[PDB]
């Protein structure tokens, strides 16, 4: 076998659909290239993944302001969102009943985006008052009320487009991380923080490029292939790009680079120009191999029009993926199976304890 | 298709063997009953399975008084581990060499010890000074020194024996969880804190058997046999006995019994008598069945001796797997391969926003 379990169909799912062969992604039979280009706003795309339909869309956040304030977004919102359980009073999963465990995930979920903004905005910057975030006419406008006080309004649209495309993504490892610990019947506070756990990993996949330093550069040089061309022949990787995901182009890669030229994004000059430099470079230089734009690279550009800094493009992710977590916990109580894999032990037999290396110092009792 | 990846093999380890058929459990090829028997202490049983070898035990924590105070022990432990990263400027583990790593884990795991002895101990007592648990010996020692002020030489070894023999058991939910946040690159406090939210539901297996009231009602009824068929008459479970795990005796099983009769534990008397008598009284109803001792039921006699309360013991279990989840996280690391499984849609083709119920109350 072949370690990391790569391949291994572990659940079915009618929640959403990456069609990597035919090139596009649907949630819940929904294109997610119509929702962008629909304007359908997050939180209705919440409930098309959770429930199946357009019929209850996430509420707002209630006031609580953020307890944690660890220093990093990301942390603040996993320790933060583990603590609803005992104040919230939610109990295990194996407890409650399916509308329970759904209206458990909306209050979570709202609230998680309202930590990252709390957080996002920080300790040294008194907080906005919730009556000039009631004014707002959705959760994504609500969110970056909370966290910039007075948004740029297509900094919104710009924000919805990139969460509504990086909502769900089938069983990457955050998504496995919540279904595998609400298999255990724990609490849905309980999955989320995990799942926030595992979206923190730099491998996790569809965490936001590294490519400001590089859009910097052209924008400072003009010569987009010389560019890229620096960064390769000086051996560094170029960010953004690498082997195909989807057949072709990445759908939510499309999207979002058609967010970043719909906005007006100031950015999407250069990261047009870089994009097809770097593309023709590196297909160029491995002509064996298949280059497409990695989604990530389109994401750090919609991220940084709607002024989300880099240290805090991970938590974006984290909150637009909320939908699809909940999506796959919900399926996955339903479901009522324990996740377990086995492992085996392959090395040395038995052996005495004074014939391992440094008994000596041990002492016993 | 069985969902759910049962009996599909993630891993390969060498970190140990619950060696079932044989009835035995290695940690690196040493047999838990020699460590057990021979009292060798967890946090040298920490390094065993972490390292491969002795030497370098768990250090002592730091003094850090513990920030979260949920009302549930569990996620206080949960935040507070995730917390240590930005503090102690742990980086992600691609980003640090093993070492770096294994110097992180343990640092961050005697840390959640200290955490679950201050998170029991509670809000409404002083702290024990940090002067008085630096004249322990051992980190199993500080530990219960931290919560209990002057806690009975007896009570620490009975911890000691229980925590090496609930330090790891191959894959489960919580270890599995560990190594797949690990298997992202993310920092270790986040993979143990990820791991804390799957041991913590009633599902992950493993937590100590709910067993004080038969053992309580036994110490006043006075006959074993009599109240074990009162509670199968009921329609009840008998709680700490059920199908074989290992082959026959669960050795953990065996030397937690060992334990209890050596330290003199007050309920061992009866605990024996409850043993026998719901042993022989299952295995009667249903000859066709294996039945053995569950663990789990003599953890929570040794664990009640400890006078640790009911509602304490999932956190000492926690405690006692922490090793395990920190070995795991390190050979995971030392693997360097995302965990990346898949799952077949089976849900509805393409179709339009507009068809989709609820499309009128969508506002553009």
Known sequence: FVPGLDGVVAFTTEIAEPDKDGGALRYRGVDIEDLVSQRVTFGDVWALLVDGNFGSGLPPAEPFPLPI???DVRVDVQAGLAMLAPIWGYAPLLDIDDATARQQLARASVMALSYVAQSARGIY??????RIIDECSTVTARFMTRWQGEPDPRHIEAIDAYWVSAAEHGMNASTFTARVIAST???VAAALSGAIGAMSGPL???????VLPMLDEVERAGDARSVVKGILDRGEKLMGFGHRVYRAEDPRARVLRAAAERLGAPRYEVAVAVEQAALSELRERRPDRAIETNVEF???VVLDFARVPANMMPAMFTCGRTAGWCAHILEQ???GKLVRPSAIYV???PRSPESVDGWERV???
């Open 363 to 365: 002492l016993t009792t």
């Open 204 to 210: 996790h996949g569809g965490a936001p490029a590294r």
């Open 347 to 349: 090395g040395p037999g």
């Open 185 to 187: 019947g724990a609490d």
């Open 125 to 130: 910057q008194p907080a906005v008052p919730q």
């Open 298 to 300: 389109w994401a750090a």
């Open 333 to 335: 109580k339903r479901l």
């Open 69 to 71: 304030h660890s220093g």
